[PDB]
A paper describes a structure:
A-1(L) is a Myoviridae cyanophage isolated in 1970s9 that specifically infects the model cyanobacterium Anabaena sp. PCC 7120. Using cryo-electron microscopy (cryo-EM), we solved the structure of A-1(L) tail machine, which consists of three parts: a 205-Å-long neck, a 1045-Å-long contractile tail with a complicated baseplate, and six pairs of tail fibers. The dodecameric gp2 portal, the pentadecameric gp5 and the hexameric gp7 sequentially constitute the neck of A-1(L), to which five neck fibers are attached. The long and contractile tail of A-1(L) contains 24 rings of gp10 hexamers that form the tube, surrounded by the sheath of 24 helically stacked gp9 hexamers.
Each LTF subunit contains a shoulder and an arm domain, whereas each STF subunit consists of four domains: β-ring, joint, stem and cell wall binding domain (CBD). Structural analysis showed that the arm domain of LTF and the CBD domain of STF most likely possess the binding motifs that recognize the host receptors. Using in vitro binding assays, we observed that the arm domain of LTF, but not the CBD domain of STF, binds to the cell surface of Anabaena sp. PCC 7120. In contrast, the stem-CBD domain of STF could bind to the host cell surface. Further competition binding assays showed that the arm domain of LTF and the stem-CBD domain of STF could simultaneously bind to the surface of host cells. Altogether, it suggested that the STF/gp33 and LTF/gp34 are indeed RBPs, which recognize and bind to different receptors on the host cell surface. For A-1(L), we previously found that antibodies against either STF or LTF could strongly inhibit the infection, suggesting that they might be essential for the adsorption of A-1(L) to the host cell surface.
Author numbering:
A (entry chain C), B (entry chain B), C (entry chain A): 245 to 462
Amino acid sequence: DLSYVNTQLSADQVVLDALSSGKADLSYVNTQLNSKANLNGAVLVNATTATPPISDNDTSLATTQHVRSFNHSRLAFNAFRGGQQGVPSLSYVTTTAQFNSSSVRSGWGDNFSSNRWLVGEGGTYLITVTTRFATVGGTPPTYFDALLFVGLSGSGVENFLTRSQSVYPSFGYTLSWVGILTFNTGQNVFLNYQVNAVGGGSYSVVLEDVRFSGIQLG
Amino acid sequence: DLSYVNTQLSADQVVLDALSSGKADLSYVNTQLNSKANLNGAVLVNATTATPPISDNDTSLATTQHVRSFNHSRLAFNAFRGGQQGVPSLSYVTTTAQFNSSSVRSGWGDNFSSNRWLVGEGGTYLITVTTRFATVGGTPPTYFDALLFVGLSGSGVENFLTRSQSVYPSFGYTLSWVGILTFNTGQNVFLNYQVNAVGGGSYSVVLEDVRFSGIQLG
Amino acid sequence: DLSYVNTQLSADQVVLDALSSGKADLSYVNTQLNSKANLNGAVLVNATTATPPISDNDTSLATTQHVRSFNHSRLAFNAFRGGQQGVPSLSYVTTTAQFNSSSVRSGWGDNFSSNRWLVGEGGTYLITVTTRFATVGGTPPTYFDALLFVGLSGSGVENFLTRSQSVYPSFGYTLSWVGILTFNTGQNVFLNYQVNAVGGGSYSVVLEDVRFSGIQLG
């Protein structure tokens, strides 16, 4: 009937008004979307995450803090001795220098203990060794010799670094070597030195200011 | 015959159709949100952002340019002397080595003026020094001694580094050293060297081709 | 006719119910958007991108892989000699030591060919050189002289680095040098050494353990 038409039409009109409120406008939705970033070619400002672990090796983003930490973490290890270390035999007898203090990059399996460099991660590395061999007490030898090498007792692989010799050991010489040396993970690496001197009497060669540190390079 | 009721029925239909036309559909929005938008925990593509300043340490995202700039900024100074310099006194007198040219990284306060380096950023640094001492004129000494240490301004600190002693300075000796040191922002650092030599006569020990460069580690 | 209105109302209802089912509903839309990543205040649990090429310098985001590679990529090159070679002339003869093995970083044009380092990329590089000159057999010369300098192909720049001298060179002297050098793109660079010895007889001079390597510092 007449009144019937009124009622049913008013009912669906109410639904139309409910749809109006419950739904989103073209312009409003477009504005909200423009507020966000497109998946491709996304551009943003003042965007930040939580820094992933330094050891992280994935496609995840790195934060400025992350690069700060990483670059500083290429130092690998560092060890030094303050004072003098005796030499047992001046006849090309391999001996391992000691270190009262040492430091190591953390989070890579590296550890320095008992004057040992644990190679936490293998790869290419840069090694810089500087020490001083000197004689104190007695007559300085008429001839001196001291080779510098990255030796390893048991394997004896002595990467020859340098051989400084001179007949004025009474005041000591400083050996300096820098070069590229590769290493494999889990290796217990230590510094070996051999000294040979002829002549003199009551003389004992002395090793001091021993610097031993590495650098990580892939 | 019904009249106004059917015309309002039809009027409602018009508004209803316009309502649908000016709205946001499910299918439409889903496509924008999934294949053409970024989520949280998203997987992204090769997009771009703004380059953060090197000075920052926040968790903002780093760009390849930022990595380049930060890794290249890890030198922080390099001083070089061209020519020659004479040794003032051969009595282990604390002598401040002088420099002709220097360069420092920007954005950290590092400075190399008056032959003294300023610590722009307090922290650990790797310092390398290469000095050359030669005897010119007179008779070569029967004893030549040169001590190298990291002089701190206002103290003449004897941070002993190297002492090369040989009695053949007739042509020239080059002393080089590399090692790790720590410093704090605001500490004025210049290379003080003590040189002593005995024997000979009317000779002149000349310091030349001095290099004093420090590369930051940590 | 009520059937008339009923069929037209059924048409209205068809549109109504279709547009109701197929539409984006506000609460759900807001939920999804909140799940999405805001462009300005972007803070995401994690996110990944294709590892951009190491050479990239745009404002594209950096990956942990990229950070590792670039630092590892900053080695520039390396050159090493295995075995011993004889020094041809002790007469200040400009001689370029040859190399048996050498590696370069990829993706920069760097190449080490003909025992000469081609500067793939211009910039500031830290150069590391280690050479040993030793006299073998017969009478060691009464004096020795060996200049170490970075000769430059095409230009003839024998950058005086260090000079190795001794009166008993029968055991070798390794005056390894380190410092900061600048180079322009495409420059072909080698290393030249001039050796002069005085006195002695029936002695052969040997060059051994030649390491030549640099790293692209800032």
